[PDB]
């Protein structure tokens, strides 16, 4: 499609992160309102999820079980809320500094960009012991995504680049995007195409697997886009942070 639609969220203030579940429900961190909202597919009415005590939530992820994970940026913690639950749980990460992005793989392992510590950490399901991933030279990493192969993609915000680390690899690779300015968010679809919010350039770019040539997606009127998500239909969802809105673009 060449034509975005603005999703019917209400009252957003600088939305940061977005995620979409297998049912097409869209989850958004309403950063400026210390809340997380969701919108079911076709619904005109959001619901505020029952998290407690959030401070400028940044990133959001949702797993196949419908559990919602949120980086509670201002409180240096990551919280999760099981589907239908009333009570969040704080995940046992240690030593976070302004965590910024979160992703969850098919095994339930949780990956977090520890923005203030220039590192990415992961926590296996049920584990009490995080592991720091062997990225090199990160500067304020913002967003993270993980594909079905376990490859981890990170927007290295301060270095104007996107890096990836294959499962079990010691050595990251810098993806061949061009001309990025403070990239914030990243998503990867089932075909391995990587989508990045090029925050400082008011645009969203994608790079197909093995391609050397990005394409700029035909969104219009973006202002400092933060987060991006892609569903199984290839629809791309973007938090248009500066315009207090969320937009989507069908394939």
Farthest CA pair distance, the chain: 46
d(CA 9, CA 37) in angstroms, rounded, equals: 8
Q: Burial, 81: exposed, middle or buried (Cβ in 10 Å; 0-12, 13-18, 19+)? A: buried
d(CA 42, CA 128) in angstroms, rounded, equals: 39
**In terms of residue numbers, what domain contains 83?**
1-251
d(CA 33, CA 15) in angstroms, rounded, equals: 9
The CATH number that applies at residue 50 is 2.120.10.30
Joined tokens for residue 213: 């040539």
Please tell me the total count of domains within the chain: 1
Technique of determination: X-ray
Asked whether the CA dihedral 88, 91, 96, 101 is positive or negative, the reply is negative
Rg (CA), the chain: 16
- Sheet with 194-198, side-by-side order of all strands: 186-188, 194-198, 203-207, 215-216
Contact 197, 180 (CB under 8 A): no
Phi, psi of 164, rounded to the nearest 5 degrees: -135, 155
């Amino acid at each position: 499609s060449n034509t975005q639609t603005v999703l019917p969220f209400t009252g957003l203030n600088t939305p940061s992160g977005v995620a979409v579940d297998s049912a097409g429900t869209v989850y958004v961190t309403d950063h400026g309102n210390n809340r997380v909202v969701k919108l079911a597919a076709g619904s005109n009415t959001q619901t505020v999820l029952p998290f407690t005590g959030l401070n400028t939530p940044s990133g959001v992820a949702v797993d196949s079980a419908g559990t919602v994970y949120v980086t509670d940026h201002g409180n240096n913690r990551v919280v999760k809320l099981a589907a239908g639950s009333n009570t969040q749980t704080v995940l046992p990460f240690t030593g976070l500094n302004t965590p910024s992005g979160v992703a969850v793989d098919s095994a339930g392992t949780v990956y977090v960009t520890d923005h203030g510590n220039n590192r990415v950490v992961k926590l296996a399901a049920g584990s009490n012991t995080q592991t720091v991933l062997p990225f090199t030279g990160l500067n304020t990493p913002s967003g993270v995504a993980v594909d079905s192969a376990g490859t981890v993609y990170v927007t290295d915000h301060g270095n104007n680049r996107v890096v990836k680390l294959a499962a079990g690899s010691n050595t990251q690779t810098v993806l061949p995007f061009t001309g990025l300015n403070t990239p914030s968010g990243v998503a990867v679809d089932s075909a391995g195409t990587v989508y990045v919010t090029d925050h400082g350039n008011n645009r969203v770019v994608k790079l197909a697997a093995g391609s050397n040539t990005q394409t700029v997606l035909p969104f219009t009127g973006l202002n400092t886009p933060s987060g991006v998500a892609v569903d199984s239909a290839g629809t791309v969802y973007v938090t248009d942070h500066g315009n207090n809105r969320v937009v989507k673009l069908a394939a």
